[PDB]
From a paper:
Strikingly, the TFAM-NS2 structure showed a unique arrangement. All TFAM-DNA structures determined to date have revealed that a molecule of TFAM interacts with a molecule of DNA (1:1 ratio of TFAM to DNA) (19,20,30,35). However, in the TFAM-NS2 structure, the binding site of TFAM was composed of two halves of adjacent DNA molecules. HMG box 1 of a TFAM molecule interacts with half of a DNA molecule, while HMG box 2 binds to a different DNA molecule (see scheme on Figure 5B). Intriguingly, the TFAM-NS2 structure was also bound a GN10G consensus, although in this case the consensus was formed between two adjacent DNA molecules. Importantly, Abf2p plays no role in transcriptional initiation, perhaps suggesting that this ability might be relevant to the role of these proteins in mtDNA packaging.
Mitochondrial transcription factor A (TFAM) plays a critical role in mitochondrial transcription initiation and mitochondrial DNA (mtDNA) packaging. Both functions require DNA binding, but in one case TFAM must recognize a specific promoter sequence, while packaging requires coating of mtDNA by association with non sequence-specific regions. TFAM is composed of two tandem high-mobility group (HMG) domains connected by an α-helix linker. In this study, we identified two TFAM residues, Ser61 in HMG box1 and Pro178 in HMG box2, that form specific hydrogen bonds with N2 of two guanine bases separated by 10 nucleotides (GN10G consensus).
Residue numbers in the entry:
A (entry chain A): 44 to 236
B (entry chain B): 44 to 233
The structure:
Amino acid sequence: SVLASCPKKPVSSYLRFSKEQLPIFKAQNPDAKTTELIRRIAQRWRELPDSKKKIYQDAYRAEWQVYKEEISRFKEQLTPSQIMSLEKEIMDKHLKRKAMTKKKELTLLGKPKRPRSAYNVYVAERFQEAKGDSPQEKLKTVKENWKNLSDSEKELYIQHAKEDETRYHNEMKSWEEQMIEVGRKDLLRRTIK
Amino acid sequence: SVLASCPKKPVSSYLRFSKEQLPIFKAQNPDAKTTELIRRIAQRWRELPDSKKKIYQDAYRAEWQVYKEEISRFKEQLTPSQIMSLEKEIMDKHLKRKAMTKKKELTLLGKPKRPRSAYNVYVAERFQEAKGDSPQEKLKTVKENWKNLSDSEKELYIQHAKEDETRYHNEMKSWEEQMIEVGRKDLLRR
DNA sequence: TAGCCTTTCTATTAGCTCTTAG
DNA sequence: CTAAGAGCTAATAGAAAGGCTA
DNA sequence: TAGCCTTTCTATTAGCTCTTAG
DNA sequence: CTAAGAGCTAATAGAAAGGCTA
């Protein structure tokens, strides 16, 4: 909202060169992978005489002066409420990226899944059965069927949950022992129940 | 600040008991550490019959109903801009506490100071020799007498700024390798 | 992976005093 | 949706010098 | 320790494409 | 300013089950 309209900074000298060069490298080798092309483009950059790098550097510097003007005139026409909104939007985006980065990191470190309750075991064992033309409606259905379960049957899912609590404690003790060894004592629970 | 005026949540039963008891314990033991009074207060709570703990829980539950009412009519009267401000204030507070906790932790772990710049070394030695009514107004004198400095005079301080850059690299490889010992690779640069 | 739907759980964190020290 | 990968440039945040008041 | 003042530095992270896969 | 310490209670955030579309 405020962030959407905020002037964006110009790209540096090399990234400018990189974006005219990529489509020509791609058009000549449409099968070769983008990581190989960028790897091939970087050196066209290293090899490029400094008289030619200066053409890209001069454009960057000239656009940097447009940016300074654009951003100064932008920030100074914002109301206090729009300044707060811009700061909250930037903060929220940064936190979304940090949270997402941490989840990918913990998956690479092989963090155990948390205990799956009897309802979670139910949703796994009997979801695609549930009538629904949308995954959200197949779940909406699962919630009613879960309630309609006989007491006899729900105790079957409670024991599956019970034995998964044991799996959680075992795997966590093992994973947390491994994190101290990898030097990630920070990833440990402070309150281990 | 929207958060300043926001109804706060009631304290749980033990903290209600703890409140009335601390003055009594303090008055009876005035040379005792607050940490020891709270330890003895928790002991009284543990010993307290559940019929008496329920008196404090019933008050909590009754105050929880007052809270729900107060917070809903407070938030209903907030403009969209005040709702966004309240949410930003809550998050900023949480992050200020996280950042502050990390700085205290790194000070206990004895993290090396970063490299002092030539300006930094000029402020340290020539600060109290500068005219100024307030510490901010003393720094303006040093900032003005830094700008005016000769290149040869700058080199005298630039002598410390280069030997301190060595001190930083040395102390950091020592501290970072010690942080691997304690199992805190997360605190390294990388 | 996030977010949609509901339900359910674990781990975290909020609250309070009063002194010390960051 | 968007981070990762494959590169480079450089703006950015925050720490650092001092001390006094939150 | 944060934040006030200015200046200065180090470490981080932003930018770009296009495909893959989280 | 406020975290730490010395305790307890419980609200809260976010993960978990599934799959499909950002």
